Write a protein that binds this ligand. Structure first.
Ligand SMILES: Nc1nc2c(ncn2[C@@H]2O[C@H](COP(=O)(O)OP(=O)(O)OP(=O)(O)O)[C@@H](O)[C@H]2O)c(=O)[nH]1
Ligand SMILES: Nc1ncnc2c1ncn2[C@@H]1O[C@H](COP(=O)(O)OP(=O)(O)CP(=O)(O)O)[C@@H](O)[C@H]1O
Ligand SMILES: Nc1nc2c(ncn2[C@@H]2O[C@H](COP(=O)(O)OP(=O)(O)O)[C@@H](O)[C@H]2O)c(=O)[nH]1
Ligand SMILES: [Ca+2]
Ligand SMILES: [Mg+2]
Ligand SMILES: [Mg+2]
Lengths: 427, 437, 334, 54
């Protein structure tokens, strides 16, 4: 089951590049594209993400997209920049200027066909394509505007394939422009309809974690991306290595999505660690279980005690007592059963993988479909309404052909999403 | 001699099939390459073991079995397994993508594009038979393939083989090893559609097997391999009468006659004893009275329930090892005065007993210790309905909110089939109630 | 931190138990339909026993014994007593009874009715109380449900002053190990009006229910004499104790009834465990010979004894299975 | 008490002990169910592509 990776825009390509850097090390692949590992566990399901060439060369099944060559040139000069298939570098020149309209309707529409030709070329090589995964931000123009355009056009040509996304949410604490709430709201509207799985990666949470927890006075996008690549590696573990639980994109969706619109997941991770700073003490299983469930470890700035878990997917990595894992996992549910909906029996599913990530003897990645995620969308909606009630900064969009009604619709659909999450919180 | 074909559907069905046929080969002395030195009728015959094995002129004894799975990874391990020479390609069928834990995807969507192929591959086995009794179907309740494709197959077999009997070996879902949250949906759906097409079904709750492995074999975290090798011993005990010389349950029709007075109530409870750890340093071999008494302990059942608060319709005792009728009758007499065994008024209170002198075989390197005498009790007790109650409750909880329903409707299934399936289960729970109290 | 649920709101007894548990700060009450519980204070009808002991990582306990209705139902108790070899055809401590279905063993009942009439001895029975078999059979058929006919004890022990009638209520607790614990504090639910031997129509001095009586509160408070007073009365009025003259018979009948059904309800090797509080109702004749009347599967306690008993339940039936961070019972050994 | 139908052989022996006496759809319909569900998938996919076309 092959997965086609796509990364759009500045953010998408920077986390996307970091992602391929991390897992390539886990799969024993070097920047040259050659395998140099010791375990066969690394190569059993390496076909999910990597295409194999002659001489046993492994090339990422990745497509790099951007409306400006700035960020993508940095990738190509980066550490693993050479591993990527050069023909998969599809880019424009104009940029999107943090404008959703430009990325979705004008500037991006001019480039989207070139991308879909690459997607089609990869898909035809697949023995059994299971779906796609996208990495992008929702605050910009390209990754947000053109990203959602690609998703819509991919669904049209591959309507029976799973669409997954790693969507970075904007935050005033880490803000490029004032029009990010606009771009985000417009994008959420698209994600609710045309994705089966979306990992909500809040920049607010990534900042607070770096500041409050990791004690980084002034975190950079690099510090933020250490957390993302760690999370991205974890949530895809069950897909990249032999396992029984959530081994493919579809089975994951069946177990995580009780209702089609409610498919926005809170990622969590433990132990939280900063770059460079190596920890010498390995966490006990009770510590991993306690931390990965704590709000301070969630990648989405939401309080899980303000909502209820519809479904949960956990994955412990490293060498540990799987019995102790089963016990601690059962202990959480039994101690805090109120925070798990009773009308979905056994909604928590745990898995274990022998291979830990780099730097850590053991770790645990959390994936939760909590109703408390609404706090994220409500936050975007408030920042959206604050400007939209005065029609502020709207001329950037109407100049690209957009009407005010399209904003009102996007606003209404996200407020609906909030109310739907609220419906199952009081069930 | 009348032949029996074994169908293995889904991951659970295939992997359990591997455990059973592995065990069969060791019981009959058949080697991994299929050669059976003891069989002196080269190229054919009509012995008792021929019920499960056909024969080639080359002297190979191949299982009368078909393996089907909508995803190749599992069966591929059979194609390259230690018994790869035992079967032939036409017996191993594999699709591209699985049913993704979805009944509707395994039954309607993906089930439609392979049902004709499987039946053809089954017909090729049936043509090699002189007197086909029927089929033994191995599958899970939880899986999309095990649930979805099985029900479709069981429907077509009733059309293509109307006169033939069809038995089930079903794996009842357990959270401790569950792979999906919607397994309760898949279980009710496949039960409803298969009910009228099944003559006798042996349910095995993974929960029960899981705790037996932990309690009696001292395995902290039982793998599927640990579960399966134990299950195969139970299955072997049940099918031993079809593969060995005897006069009890010699054909499929007799399973229904002896265990299933009422058609819908065709879920006999299985209880096995003794289960002993191979790593147990010192073990005192248990007697006929002790192992027979263990057949009435819920901790030894394939499904955890309380037969005391129900009623029996039938009861078979299948022994393997040093056992004679005299000891059994003495054991039954003692137990009868100690335990609560209530039969329905329209049934005689008795026990059909079967004994094979050959003690139970154990897989070399397995977790089970060799024993001098073992027993498997097949009792049709209304207490097994507790499993239906557990399962239907979880079904009601999720369906009240219509959770995950869209996955099934998205495959062309109607939301009405959910309620129709649940209504059939509600009637089934009532049938058990009328007979039980 | 243990967890529990409540599915019987009318339970005055376990309403206090739930209160005590929460007051320890180590027990948390969940919702009715929350399956992740350690303890279940279940309902009286259709308690789902089949859904117990199937939660991994949880040791589950329930305050009811499955199958214990065979002892707590009048029609069942008679059958149990008459069929069970341990209790036999005619145990001396149970009144001669018969099971009668509305239009079974009606013919058997009349056979014994003749001996009493053709012997010129006491021939009064109870379902209403009467000495004519025809008056009774016409009453059962007129009600609708199954009833039990039973020999009426015509020579009951009578408390003085007052010449009254009474019945003893003993509270028994059976834990998960099936240890039979008799509560040391029982109660005599006495009649306030003098017992009338001739007129059976007046069921106010024949029936000693706490509701019927409510001369209420003349001799003792609320028609409830405790053991300290009843014992003192026996010593003064009969030169004997409560232990000797009655309690040995009570402890015997209790020990016998539960041993009889132990293998049918025991949760020794089960996937879930059970305990339960019973309320046995006894009857004493003039010769100080105790008679079993019935058993209640869902008994209520006496206001004075609620605190002590409800606490007692927590200690031996609950806290024994779920320990936290001299005794008021009498262990009937076996 | 009463043992009956005692049958014996080299492999073993069987018998019965009594303690106390007593007191389909056609191929047509199937193909109709499968194809009908296939149409419902086609309609659902058509409505999607229609919606996306808009
Ligand atoms: N006892 C036992 N149970 C198994 C085994 N394999 C899977 N199961 C159970 O089967 C249920 C799921 O069914 P599967 O057989 O895995 O799925 P499937 O039949 O391949 O159908 P798909 O969903 O299309 O993959 C789970 O609840 C498992 O606990 C096994 O080897 N032994
Ligand atoms: N065989 C008998 N001989 C004499 N008196 C009897 C009797 N059977 C019952 N009684 C009297 O009738 C009263 C009530 O009868 P019973 O106790 O059978 O009804 P109940 O079951 O509604 C009361 P509880 O709520 O305590 O269970 C008894 O307390 C006793 O005083
Ligand atoms: N975590 C993270 N977020 C980023 C990064 N770069 C931009 N963003 C976020 O994405 C938004 C800006 O979008 P951007 O990626 O620059 O738009 P695009 O390049 O035109 O698609 C802002 O809300 C930023 O917080 C990055 O390197 N890491
Ligand atoms: Ca031969
Ligand atoms: Mg930018
Ligand atoms: Mg499978």
């Amino acid at each position: 089951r092959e997965i086609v990776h796509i990364q759009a825009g500045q953010c998408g390509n920077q986390i996307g590049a970091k992602f391929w850097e991390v897992i390539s090390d886990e799969h024993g692949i070097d920047p040259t594209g050659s395998y140099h590992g010791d375990s066969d566990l690394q190569l059993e399901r390496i076909n999910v993400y990597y295409n194999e060439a002659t001489g046993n060369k492994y090339v990422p099944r990745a497509i790099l997209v951007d409306l400006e060559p700035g960020t993508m040139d940095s990738v190509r000069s980066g550490p693993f920049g050479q591993i990527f298939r050069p023909d998969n570098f599809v880019f424009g020149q104009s940029g999107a200027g943090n404008n959703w309209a430009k990325g979705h309707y004008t500037e991006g529409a001019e480039l989207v066909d070139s991308v879909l030709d690459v997607v089609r070329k990869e898909s035809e090589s697949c023995d059994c394509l299971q779906g796609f995964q996208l990495t992008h931000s929702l605050g910009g123009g390209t990754g947000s505007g053109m990203g959602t355009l690609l998703i819509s056009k991919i669904r049209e040509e591959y309507p029976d394939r799973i669409m997954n996304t790693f969507s970075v949410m904007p935050s005033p604490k880490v803000s490029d422009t004032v029009v990010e709430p606009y771009n985000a709201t417009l994008s959420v509207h698209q994600l609710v309809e045309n994705t089966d799985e979306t990992y909500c990666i809040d920049n607010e949470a990534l900042y607070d974690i770096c500041f409050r927890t990791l004690k980084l006075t002034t975190p950079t996008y690099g510090d933020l991306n250490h957390l993302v690549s760690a999370t991205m590696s974890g949530v895809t573990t069950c897909l990249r290595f032999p396992g029984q639980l959530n081994a493919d994109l579809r089975k994951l969706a069946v177990n995580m999505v009780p209702f089609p619109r409610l498919h926005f997941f809170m990622p969590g991770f433990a132990p939280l660690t900063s770059r460079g700073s190596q920890q010498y003490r390995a966490l006990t299983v009770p510590e991993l279980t306690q931390q990965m469930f704590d709000s301070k470890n969630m990648m989405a700035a939401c309080d899980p005690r303000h909502g209820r878990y519809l479904t949960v997917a956990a994955i412990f990595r490293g060498r540990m007592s799987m019995k102790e894992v089963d016990e601690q996992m059962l202990n959480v549910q039994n101690k805090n059963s109120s925070y798990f909906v009773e009308w979905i029996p056994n909604n928590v599913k745990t898995a274990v993988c022998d291979i830990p990530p780099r730097g850590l003897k053991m770790s645990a990645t959390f994936i939760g479909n909590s109703t408390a995620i609404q706090e994220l969308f409500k936050r975007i909606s408030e920042q959206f309404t604050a400007m939209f009630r005065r029609k502020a900064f709207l001329h950037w969009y109407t100049g690209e052909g957009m009407d005010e009604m399209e904003f009102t619709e996007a606003e209404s659909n996200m407020n609906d999403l909030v109310s739907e999450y609220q419906q199952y919180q009081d069930a | 001699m009348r032949e029996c074909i074994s169908i293995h559907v889904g991951q659970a069905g295939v992997q359990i099939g591997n455990a059973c046929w592995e065990l069969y080969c060791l019981e009959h002395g058949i080697q991994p390459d299929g050669q059976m030195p003891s069989d002196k009728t080269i190229g054919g015959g009509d012995d008792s073991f021929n019920t499960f094995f056909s024969e080639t002129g080359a002297g190979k004894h191949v299982p009368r079995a078909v393996f089907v799975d909508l995803e190749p990874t599992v069966i591929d391990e059979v194609r390259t397994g230690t018994y790869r020479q035992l079967f032939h390609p036409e017996q191993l069928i594999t699709g591209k993508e699985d049913a993704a834990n979805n009944y509707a995807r395994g039954h309607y969507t993906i089930g439609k594009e392979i049902i004709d192929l499987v039946l053809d591959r089954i017909r090729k086995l049936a043509d090699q038979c002189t007197g086909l009794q029927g089929f033994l179907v191995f599958h899970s309740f939880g899986g999309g393939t095990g649930s979805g494709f099985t029900s479709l197959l069981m429907e077509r077999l009733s059309v293509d083989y109307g006169k033939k009997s069809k038995l089930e070996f079903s794996i009842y879902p357990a959270p401790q090893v569950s792979t999906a949250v919607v397994e309760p949906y898949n279980s009710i759906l496949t039960t409803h559609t298969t009910l009228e097409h099944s003559d006798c079904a042996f349910m095995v709750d993974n929960e029960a097997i899981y705790d037996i492995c932990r309690r009696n074999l001292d395995i902290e975290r039982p793998t599927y391999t640990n579960l399966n090798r134990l299950i195969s011993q139970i299955v072997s005990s049940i099918t031993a009468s079809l593969r060995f010389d005897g006069a009890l349950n010699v054909d499929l029709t007799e399973f229904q006659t002896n265990l299933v007075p009422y058609p819908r109530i065709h879920f006999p409870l299985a209880t096995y004893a003794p289960v002993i750890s191979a790593e147990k340093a010192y073990h005192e071999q248990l007697s006929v009275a002790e192992i027979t008494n263990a057949c009435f302990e819920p901790a030894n059942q394939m499904v955890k329930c309380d037969p005391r608060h129900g009623k029996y319709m039938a009861c078979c005792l299948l022994y393997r090892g040093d056992v004679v009728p005299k000891d059994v009758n003495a054991a039954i007499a003692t137990i009868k005065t100690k335990r609560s065994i209530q039969f329905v008024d329209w049934c005689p209170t008795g026990f059909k007993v079967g004994i094979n002198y050959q003690p139970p075989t154990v897989v070399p390197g397995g977790d089970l210790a060799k024993v001098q005498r073992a027993v498997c009790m097949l009792s049709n007790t209304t207490a097994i309905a507790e499993a239906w109650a557990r399962l239907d409750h979880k079904f009601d909880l999720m369906y009240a909110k219509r959770a995950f329903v869209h996955w099934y409707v998205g495959e062309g299934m109607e939301e009405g089939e959910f309620s129709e399936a649940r209504e059939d289960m509600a009637a089934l729970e009532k049938d058990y109630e009328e007979v039980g109290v | 931190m243990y967890t529990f649920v409540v599915r019987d709101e009318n339970s005055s007894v376990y309403a206090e138990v739930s209160r005590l548990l929460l007051a320890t700060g180590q027990w948390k009450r969940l919702r009715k339909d929350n399956p992740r519980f350690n303890l279940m204070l279940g309902e009286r009808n259709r308690l789902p026993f089949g859904r117990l002991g199937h939660e991994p990582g949880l040791v589950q306990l329930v305050n009811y014994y499955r199958g214990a209705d065979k002892l707590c139902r009048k029609a069942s108790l008679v059958k149990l007593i008459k069929t069970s070899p341990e209790l036999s055809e005619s145990c001396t401590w149970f009144p001669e009874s018969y099971v009668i279905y509305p239009t079974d063993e009606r013919e058997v009942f009349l056979a014994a009715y003749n001996r009493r009439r053709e012997g010129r001895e006491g021939n009064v029975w109870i379902a209403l109380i009467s000495s004519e078999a025809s008056e009774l059979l016409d009453f059962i058929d007129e009600q609708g449900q199954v009833h039990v006919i039973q020999k009426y004890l015509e020579k009951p022990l009578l408390l003085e002053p007052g010449h009254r009638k009474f019945d003893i209520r003993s509270w028994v607790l059976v834990d998960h190990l099936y240890n039979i614990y008799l509560y040391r504090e029982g109660v005599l639910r006495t009649s306030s009006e003098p017992y009338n031997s001739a007129n059976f129509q007046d069921k106010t001095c024949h029936l000693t229910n706490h509701c019927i009586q409510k001369n209420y509160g003349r001799y003792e408070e609320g028609n409830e004499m405790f053991f300290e007073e009843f014992n003192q009365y026996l010593m003064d009025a009969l030169n004997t104790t409560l232990e000797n003259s009655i309690l040995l018979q009570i402890k015997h009948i209790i020990r016998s009834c539960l041993m009889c059904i132990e293998p049918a309800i025991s949760t020794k090797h089960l996937h879930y465990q059970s305990f339960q509080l019973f309320g046995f109702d006894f009857m004493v004749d003039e010769e100080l010979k105790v008679w079993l009347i019935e058993v209640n599967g869902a008994p209520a306690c006496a206001q004075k004894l609620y605190a002590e008993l409800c606490q007692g339940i927590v200690d031996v039936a609950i806290s024994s299975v779920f320990p936290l961070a001299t005794s008021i019972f009498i262990k009937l050994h076996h | 008490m009463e043992v009956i139908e005692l049958n014996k052989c080299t492999s073993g022996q069987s018998f019965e002990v009594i303690l106390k006496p007593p007191s389909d759809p056609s191929l047509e319909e199937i193909q109709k169910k499968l194809e009908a569900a296939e149409e419902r998938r086609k309609y659902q996919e058509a409505e999607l592509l229609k919606h996306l076309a808009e």
